[model samples]
Target chain A: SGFRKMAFPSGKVEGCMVQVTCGTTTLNGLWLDDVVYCPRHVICTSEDMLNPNYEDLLIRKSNHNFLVQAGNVQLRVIGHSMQNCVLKLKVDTANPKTPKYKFVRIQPGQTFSVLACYNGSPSGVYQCAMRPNFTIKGSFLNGSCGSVGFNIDYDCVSFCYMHHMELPTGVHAGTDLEGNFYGPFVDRQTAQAAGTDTTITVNVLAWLYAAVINGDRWFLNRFTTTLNDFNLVAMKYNYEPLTQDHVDILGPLSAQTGIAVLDMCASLKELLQNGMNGRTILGSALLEDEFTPFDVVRQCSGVT
Target chain B: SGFRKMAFPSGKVEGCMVQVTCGTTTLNGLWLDDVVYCPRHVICTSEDMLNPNYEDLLIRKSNHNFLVQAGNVQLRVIGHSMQNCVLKLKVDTANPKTPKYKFVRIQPGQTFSVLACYNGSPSGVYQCAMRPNFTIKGSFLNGSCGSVGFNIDYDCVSFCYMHHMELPTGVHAGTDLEGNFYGPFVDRQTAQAAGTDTTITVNVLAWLYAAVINGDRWFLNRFTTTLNDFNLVAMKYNYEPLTQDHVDILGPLSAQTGIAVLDMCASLKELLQNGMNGRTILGSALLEDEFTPFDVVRQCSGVT
Candidate 1:
């Protein structure tokens, strides 16, 4: 029966045919060079298999579909009522308290993407989960639950780093599609590398300025020193572009201070329109040491 | 020794002379109709002594000056350091949990005014307090503290009443200088009498509308029934004049809902400008039976 040539009184069988079945569903297969091979349905695809990046892929699949376990990633199906369920991909390297991840609601044939580094490190062991009615399944790397999920060793590059020359500790960073970077950094080399584009770097700085105005202690503590370095970099690279994203990020900060961040954006635009240098615009005394963000905005707007 | 006629050897004394001393300061006096009358300095003055209204008076006086105890109001001086202190007038008639009052910062010669009806009943046993370094000197009528303070039996008229036809209980009512009335009322007679003016009635309605939009339960609960009566009264009196005070009261409500109360003001102005009848304008289906204040504002603004 195991690839053995069988002979009857009138007929002889020379080759072996193979078919695979999982549960009641038979797997689709193809034979190449007399070898039986089962073709698997690729559910979720990584952005780049060769290089690591802050990209997470979420897809919905039927329980009847056989999943393909490629490379180091393994997909396992569990759960009884798996009609339509959402899958989330999360990283295990970051602090368990504030882990990095993204979630997607599964439709019949649609795929969704989310920022994998909204909070913590982008790189590490990434795991999957099926969102149940009340609880999650297989969020932890080694934890077991009833759901279709996966675990993969994601070797992502350092998106950015939150480090200051004076501070001993820092947070790992990553950039979302919106060009907003999580970790505020002192070194421009790592920032630029992680950002990968001038627009992104500018957005990162804009976010940094907003976070400082938002009274974030991490940004506020390093604001003065980091601003000096950022100004120098801006001047060197002539990075003075203003985008709506810059103004958009200032919405909540604007509401809190009762001063319009749009006014600040407009002021910056006016300075830029007048062909002022980066140092003159960003390094002005109005933007310097201030007690409160309200003071900063008030001073910047020339309001007494 | 209290009052004695003095006679010298060279001259005969015809009349008796009297003098009074509070601490080291001599009291000023005048002889009126054979009686020695001490002309006490009047510090804080009430608006109307005969009829009670929602009016609060605040004033600063020197410690050297002798205070006049007018009628039932008594001013008692206490504490060592009474150089510069603010005096607040509060009522003790309403529930002790939510008392009514106003505060003023005392300057050398400047007088300030504040709303006594910003909280509870305008008419009551009004008490005084001097704001100290941290704690208040004498907020409670029976409690004693170190400060120059007063207690007065203010027999104020019921500025307005807050009884709804369906509700079991209601709050006491009053009006401020801005024509804004608290304690939403069901009876038009009481509302109009307390309001005393067409402009004030219109303002009260505007405030009621705003309070309803502000999601205040008291106003929201009484809005529909009150609106019917208010609209009927408006029809009878043709009270449709719009004021800046009406729009000004809508500021906080506007900020909370993100819908401009100014727009509501403008819409009302437009209705008035078009010579639309008050009944038609106010009784429109657009302003009726809305879920949230945002919905009401949105519906009134004709925003889908």
Candidate 2:
């Protein structure tokens, strides 16, 4: 394996055809020319560009459906799950241009998995490419849908646009596809739908109403988190009817559909849109208005 | 706070005499200021900061209107509360910086709550200045209710809007000071009475669906959070027909909401989207699909 580490972590056998996962391809039947081991190696193709060994591997395999021949070791690796719904993965150093790689014959499922495996790091940020599978089907209601190659690495929280029927409030699906829009995070359906006229109305109204409960829930969630008791969450709700209760329903709907709901629930409930212009501003300032600065602390009497 | 560090560990406080929790505040009545016995030495305002210490120690004779002769320790203190009728807060430091600072006049129930409190080589990323107190209020549905400031912090899970409704969905007091045609989550009041039409249709359709569940004492909330868990959260369900069946529902909501719920419920799920992707792809080729570079490992593997 042309890993980035200076040395590989030893251990291979003569006839051992070790399978390595690169990304979306199962490289096969190669007698590793020379064996190398990497213990603290960063398994990245990006690093392979600088690897000297990469030169030979790319050159030797340039023109044939070749089987590498080393003393006794063999290597065949592609993306994460090579042997599975397997895609042939080749790091074509020769044609190092267009895609420089492709998911030979596999469907989209495993393709996504491979990308994420290779790209994700310990940090919470998402890493995969925009997408590689479902191309944008089209756009409607000022949004696009369909699929794109997904990378599990790039996104952790993403959403799909459900049929307009699925939207909570005024949102009616204007245009978009319906499918398992899995991402390392999200898709166009949601992006498109998030801005629809219906979405705007519902989202803003929900925002306004939730703003009202912003203060109340702030304390409510703090205490509940401390106690590990969600019951208090229920107690803290400012109930509205389902048709009129877009905020509360979003969470539940998200649960039912298995998609990621945005933090809009809290954002709407608490985040101040226009600090001073809020209708509740005057009411919240009651305490501030009542107290004169000096009258608020401990002190002794003095000559007036 | 055990949680001040585990699931998510961080707490911040900045404001007056209201109450000090994670950190300590000094009692102005005493001359001996400073933390005499904390792990770290906390500096207090020096007695020298007092303007009338000399006169106060001797004969302090004054009328009821006499002001205190203590030193004026100036520092900025910020908090959130209510006044007349508005939802307001300080969201940024750009334009207006309320000029003078005021210490909170502690009242009967006032108390400070702390999260994690520690000091060391500080991470440049840690910034507390951006936090603004959030507000929440509940306007009466039929007629009107005075708006109130919220005081909760949702370090745990956030409840969605329209948590539960006691009434059947139809027109109850659709509009007044706000409007009669606005939808739940939109800026319908500003638009023509458009949402009203859509609202009625949805009101009737989802109405039966939610009502059926309501009759079963099945609330939409349990499914929103965890799998049927918080149904017992008391006020979580519509109070109109308060029943036990409408409690304790839980689950896997959308990735965003799920992540939030999971953060509060299951610590934090190390979202495995990446390397996993590659691994899955590589493995799928060998195990599931018919796409591989070699025939030996594809179908001939029956020998294994």
Candidate 3:
């Protein structure tokens, strides 16, 4: 006799177990789990020979040794290689438009932050997960790389300092562990304290020139977010500020470069700046210049 | 003897005057102011008589010639041609849709003014008068080629400085004219000039790059304007402002020339710069670290 327990989406059943014999050998318990047993079949784990259920597949996946975490605004995906293997992490999110990816050479315990600007504003209310591929001992391994977590809510706007263990709340002047500099600082004393000098010369310079051309308070505040930082950096270095002398330096270069290039930039700069100045003063003047008081009066009085 | 004064829109009556007859007799007196006697032929001061009443084509064109004043905005029209001829002056108003004209080139001693837009800030109104183009030699001998008086009811936006005569108020620098030389000045005597320098360099540099890429502004501002002024005398001889160093400096040979390029050009540059820095940061993080906040608060908050 053979017996087995079988579970369906609706319920389960108990069936009899049976054994098969071919002269000198016999196979038993194959039908115990409710799957029909075939004599030709050599070996089996369950008494019944039924195909695997979805939950069985889940258990096999659970056997993996790694875990990945999901993120919002910015997703954090981490890989842990116990024996030091090469791995590539694949992240798939609900955003179909941007076929995004994060392919990095992550070692054990290191975390990578994904700066997600979901639909430009990061108000992304969707789901996402990270699937990783492990290459252990020079070959792609079979089975569980495991899934990163998933969620419908997520968001992060700050820049994760490279080599930082976690994302930063705000910037502070100085060098971080990975030779990373936090700056554009206005403090004169610490300006020369190492890494703060890179790329800033060109960066700060651009903002100042634009500021003069436009001169609107609102625009300056918006773009010169790091103005205070730059001020400290300049104070530290004792560099000359923007004067006609500095502007003059560009004249020959501009002439050499040609004059046509500055106007649109100038206009755009002014518009932004003036937008910050009161529009009543700036905006009103532009229209007033074209029409005369008499013209307006006549037009309004039906004298046309 | 008889006396008669006649009026006629059409043919004059052939009452009694005659010039030739087959019987060898002739008579004439059509020169009379009235057309009553000019029946067959007319007698006049000249041998071939033509009526005198209508200009006898009585084109008693009253005429004069005189002065024109200066102005700044719209103006009235008045002409001063010694011998009046039928002529009209054409004015291209600010509004392109109306192909307008104000023709009044009167006789000498009359007065009129020409309107002007100071620094091209076109806040202007009132009227103007220019009695130009006298067709006298071919003899409509119409109007006088006198002055076009200009007046001062002008207004236009600040950019009119694009063509204005004076330098702007805010810039804290002196002139090299050719769009050159000076400081981005502020209230002097140890102002925050030093900090201003850092931003200008970067701000200006980005524009220079963008300018080289697009030089339409340079060519337009340089050639299509009154910067060079009219001269037989180019005898004014003040031509060369651009130096070879300028040309060599940009090294692009200033191939691109649009001066009107870029608005807050540097801000656009910074935005692009920030983007690059971020990817680098997030990319590095995932490689060296990891994270998990309680498996993501139970997979989401039912906001799906």
Q: Point to the candidate with the largest DockQ.
A: 2
TM-score per prediction, in order, is 0.16, 0.18, 0.17
> Candidate 2, residues A1-304: lDDT per residue as tens digits?
0000000000111121223322322222211223211101112244442332432333433212323222233333221111211112332222211121121222111111100011111000011111122221111111111111211111121112211111222222211112222222221113323221111222332222332222222211211121112213323432211233333434443443332223333333332221222122212311111111111110001101
Number of clashing residue pairs, candidate 2:
145
Kindly report which residue pairs in candidate 1 clash with one another: none
Per-residue lDDT over B1-304 for candidate 2, one digit per residue giving the tens place of the 0 to 100 score: 0000001011111111111111223211100011101110011123422232322322222122111112243222122211211111111122121112212221111111111111210010110100011111112221011101111132221111110111122111111111111123221112222121111111111222222221211122322334233223212321111122211121212121332332222111111111121121111111111111111111111110
Candidate 2 Cα outliers beyond 4 Å, as residue runs: A1-119, A122-179, A182-304, B1-127, B130-304
Model 3 gets an lDDT of: 0.20
Docking class of 2: incorrect
lDDT of 2: 0.18
Best by lDDT: 1
Error of 1 at A157 (Å): 24
DockQ for all candidate structures vs. native? 0.01, 0.01, 0.01
Each model's lDDT? 0.23, 0.18, 0.20
> How does candidate 3 fare on TM-score?
0.17
Q: Give the per-residue lDDT digits (tens) of candidate 1, residues B2-69.
A: 00010010000001112222323332211112222221111222332223221221123343343322
